[PDB]
From a paper:
To identify structural mutational impacts on ACE2 binding we next determined the cryo-EM structures of variant spike-ACE2 complexes. Focus-refined structures of the ACE2-RBD interface enabled visualization of RBD mutations, revealing local structures which are identical to our previously reported structures using spikes harboring variant RBD mutations alone.
Given its crucial role in the viral replicative cycle, the spike protein represents an important therapeutic target and is a critical antigen in host immune responses.
Author numbering:
A (entry chain E): 19 to 614
B (entry chain B): 330 to 530
Write the structure that this text describes.
């Protein structure tokens, strides 16, 4: 009869067909990932093509129901999700060119091999060797060679490709009634039609700047401390008044500072909280790791893993004969099937990763009841944030003592808390200016604020201004230095990490206040607390049915992303860094004082 | 006296194939001895919810006829086979009356009714114009008209095929795994009641 009832029956038909096709595609992808064989690659490709074709057909059918004659919020949300053209609005020649450009950038990044001139007989792929040279070397010119050679080869190959990419994506986005491709990416956080809980695409940039302005003193103090320690490690290269050299940050791009923990440790003499040897001594299998993670999730009140999960998951490396992807991934196949693919080793990192991925699985299980198009996170930030909170809670010494992995006579003094917080800051605080600067640069490139002849002059200017990282030697416009990173070269949004980082500590404060923890925030463990699990599960069960602002109200009681829980988390470290930076100069100069 | 001629419960419960919920099989059981303790004390059944009568006194009472309806549904939909419920199975596939006397028995059949590629034999009716009356069977395969336009027999915009398939795969979760459901309906009519329980000697 009415348009709304017609759309509701259309969505019911779509949901039924979609679940089946999505399961077939997911199962084929699982078969490929667990078993890298040519037959699987064929089956995966075929199912993926069928799924994409189905989603084109159904988007075309979905557009015939006008949005303004539907009043139910859930039906309108699913129809809005399904009526997006995507690349379909663009012409077939340009669509084929865009797909070809994306595929060739994927191949150039994945199969990019660079080695030293005059010794070309064997080269180094980025993932095995180049990463290791970046994370473990202490030699200035070796790291400089690796950094400059990889940005020379990869950037000089990818610069015309990226120039075509920005124009095609902007054309598609303006064809889709967006200002630019940056507005298309910012549309994930857009909430429209809810009274009070509306969020705009333009509000995201303002909120990110407002939060980063509060991030800036902590990052300045951390940067000053890291600068002083790197000055100790490399005596003459680093200036007391200038920015950090780009190739010395412990990673290829400066994404994380977690590989500088050895150089910048506060109290080396004090022990670490490494529990690897304790699990080796007690013979902890990967099955025991996942069972302990399941015990953690049942302690907080969440549902335990399905029998299917245990039977169908691959939690150990299969062997030499069978090839599998080593990256840990939580798979929501659909139709009640939840699996984890992890080549679990006996390490602390794998144990924390098991908690993180099982948190991903718990979110998927919680939102499974919701309709197919709404089975996702409320935004891109929440889904990762709910795994990161489990990683936060499991890493605490209280959790390790509770499960027996740490000695009950381990002394928790202030020095161990300081060095643990510094490690967490190098992982978490250090990625925030890099993430914000990268997204702001991409937004300005898509918006047309930066002309093509001024991309790099602005980019380094942004990096000096925001990240406090200086280029080793100046780069002209023949280089494409941003696209050397995985996410930007392969068409991925990057603000999810910034939002995830803030949501992580907001959720942590909310659950710790629920659990009545009375100490420091980093000492808080959410095990044994039914109320914390209930507060989490109320948001987890919603999925994408409700606005992310309303979900954030459900957890933390705020309608917007907030930066104060992160600052509260690192407050002991913030006071310690302020004490340690009395003699040194906090802040940096954008001039070429260290090296250029 | 000495009792023989037990009721054919082997041909209902231990059947090689079960019907789809839309076209649920009904077997009328008459003129035999129905031993209900064999079913109740079995460990093979996941649901044995009896409405209107208790399982303990089933082996004593006597009924005119017994209707055994058999179908396969997803596990999550097992709850819908009850008086007063709502959902796709109850509105469009199989409706139980509120004044229902009988037992709803279900058990997981993942071993027998799932295939790796998917078992598409089992179907349910996604759409019907109106809800079903109690104990009604709809086996029509006419195109559902959700819009003002006539369907004219061929699928298209706002016209959908009524029957959809649960593609059961063994890897599915418990909610989506195939469950075989046998509903026993007990009625007493003024005719002589012949389905009686076993009498001890
Ligand atoms: C992995 O691949 C081989 C070759 O196709 C196959 O024989 C084997 O059964 C597969 N194993 C699993 C667990 O899928
Ligand atoms: C929206 O539709 C769903 C069914 O898809 C219904 O359960 C819900 O109550 C509706 N919401 C409103 C506000 O009408
Ligand atoms: C998708 O593209 C078609 C054809 O250009 C257009 O009519 C329709 O309005 C588009 N839908 C959206 C949501 O932009
Ligand atoms: C999950 O918990 C329930 C209730 O405690 C239990 O019956 C079930 O066996 C558990 N699942 C597994 C796989 O052990
Ligand atoms: C730890 O506490 C002792 C005792 O108050 C103090 O002397 C020391 O400076 C503290 N160290 C840090 C890193 O806070
Ligand atoms: C949580 O509950 C379990 C079950 O008794 C207990 O063994 C564990 O010690 C508790 N955790 C804490 C931190 O007390
Ligand atoms: C059906 O099969 C089960 C399992 O083999 C068996 O125990 C039972 O006696 C059979 N018959 C009935 C009526 O349940």
């Amino acid at each position: 009869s009415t348009i709304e009832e017609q759309a509701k029956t259309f969505l019911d038909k779509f949901n039924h067909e979609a679940e089946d096709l999505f399961y077939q595609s997911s199962l084929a992808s699982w078969n490929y990932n667990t078993n890298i064989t040519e037959e699987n690659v064929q089956n995966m490709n075929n199912a993926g093509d069928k799924w994409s074709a189905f989603l084109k057909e159904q988007s075309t059918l979905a557009q015939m129901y006008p949005l303004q004659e539907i009043q139910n919020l859930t039906v309108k949300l699913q129809l809005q999700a399904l009526q997006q053209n995507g690349s379909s609005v663009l012409s077939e020649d340009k669509s084929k060119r865009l797909n070809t450009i994306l595929n060739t950038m994927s191949t150039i990044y994945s199969t990019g091999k660079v080695c030293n001139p005059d010794n070309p007989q064997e080269c180094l792929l980025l993932e095995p060797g180049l990463n290791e040279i970046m994370a473990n070397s202490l030699d200035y010119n070796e790291r400089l060679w690796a950094w400059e050679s990889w940005r020379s080869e990869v950037g000089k190959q990818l610069r015309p490709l990226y120039e075509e990419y920005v124009v095609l994506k902007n054309e598609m986005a303006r064809a889709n009634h967006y200002e630019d491709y940056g507005d298309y990416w910012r549309g994930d956080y857009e909430v429209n039609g809810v009274d009070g809980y509306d969020y705009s695409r333009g509000q995201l940039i303002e909120d990110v700047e407002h939060t980063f302005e509060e991030i800036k003193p902590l990052y300045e103090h951390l940067h000053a401390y890291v600068r002083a320690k790197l000055m100790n490690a490399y005596p003459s290269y680093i200036s007391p008044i200038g920015c950090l050299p780009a190739h010395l940050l412990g990673d290829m791009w400066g994404r994380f500072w977690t590989n500088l923990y050895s150089l910048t440790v506060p109290f080396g003499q004090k022990p670490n909280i490494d529990v690897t040897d304790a699990m080796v001594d007690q013979a902890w299998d990967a099955q025991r790791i996942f069972k302990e993670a399941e015990k953690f999730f049942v302690s907080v009140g969440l549902p335990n893993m399905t029998q299917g999960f245990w039977e169908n998951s691959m939690l150990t490396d299969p062997g030499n004969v069978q090839k599998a992807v080593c990256h840990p991934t939580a798979w929501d196949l659909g139709k009640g099937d939840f699996r984890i693919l992890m080549c679990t080793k006996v390490t602390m990192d794998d144990f924390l990763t098991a908690h993180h991925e099982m948190g991903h699985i718990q979110y998927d299980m919680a939102y499974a009841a919701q309709p197919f198009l709404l089975r996702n996170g409320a935004n891109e930030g929440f889904h990762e944030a709910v795994g990161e909170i489990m990683s936060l809670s499991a890493a605490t010494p209280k959790h390790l003592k509770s499960i027996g992995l740490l000695s009950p006579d381990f002394q928790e003094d202030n020095e161990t808390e300081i060095n643990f917080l510094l490690k967490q800051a190098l992982t978490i605080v250090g990625t925030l200016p890099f993430t914000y600067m990268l997204e702001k640069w991409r937004w300005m490139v898509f918006k047309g604020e930066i002309p093509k002849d001024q991309w790099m002059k602005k980019w380094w200017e942004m990096k000096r201004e925001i990240v406090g990282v200086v280029e080793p030697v100046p780069h002209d416009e023949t280089y494409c230095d941003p696209a050397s990173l995985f996410h930007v070269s392969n068409d991925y949004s990057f603000i999810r990490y910034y939002t995830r980082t803030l949501y992580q500590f907001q959720f942590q404060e909310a659950l710790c206040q629920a659990a009545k923890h009375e100490g420091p925030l980093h000492k808080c463990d959410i095990s044994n607390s039914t109320e914390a699990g209930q507060k989490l599960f109320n948001m987890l069960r919603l999925g994408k049915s409700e606005p992310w602002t309303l979900a954030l109200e459900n957890v933390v009681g705020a309608k917007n992303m907030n930066v104060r829980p992160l600052l509260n988390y690192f407050e002991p470290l913030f006071t310690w860094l302020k004490d340690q930076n009395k003699n040194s100069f906090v802040g940096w100069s954008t001039d070429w004082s260290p090296y250029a | 006296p000495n009792i023989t001629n037990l009721c054919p419960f082997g041909e209902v419960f231990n059947a090689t194939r079960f019907a789809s919920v839309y076209a649920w099989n009904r077997k009328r059981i008459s003129n035999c001895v129905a031993d209900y303790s064999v079913l109740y004390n079995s460990a093979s059944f996941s649901t044995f919810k009896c409405y209107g009568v208790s399982p303990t006194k089933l082996n004593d009472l006597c009924f005119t006829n017994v209707y055994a309806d058999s179908f396969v549904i997803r596990g999550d939909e097992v709850r819908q086979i009850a008086p007063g419920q709502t959902g796709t199975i109850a509105d469009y596939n199989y409706k139980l009356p509120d004044d229902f006397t009988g037992c709803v028995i279900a058990w997981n059949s993942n071993n027998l009714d799932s295939k790796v590629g998917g078992n598409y034999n089992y179907l349910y009716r996604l759409f019907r114009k109106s809800n079903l009356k109690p104990f009604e069977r709809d086996i029509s395969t006419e195109i559902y008209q959700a819009g003002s336009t006539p369907c004219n027999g061929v699928k298209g915009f706002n016209c959908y095929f009524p029957l959809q398939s649960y593609g059961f795969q063994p890897t599915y979760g418990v909610g989506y795994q195939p469950y075989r459901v046998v509903v026993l309906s007990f009625e007493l009519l003024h005719a002589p009641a012949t389905v009686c329980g076993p009498k001890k000697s």
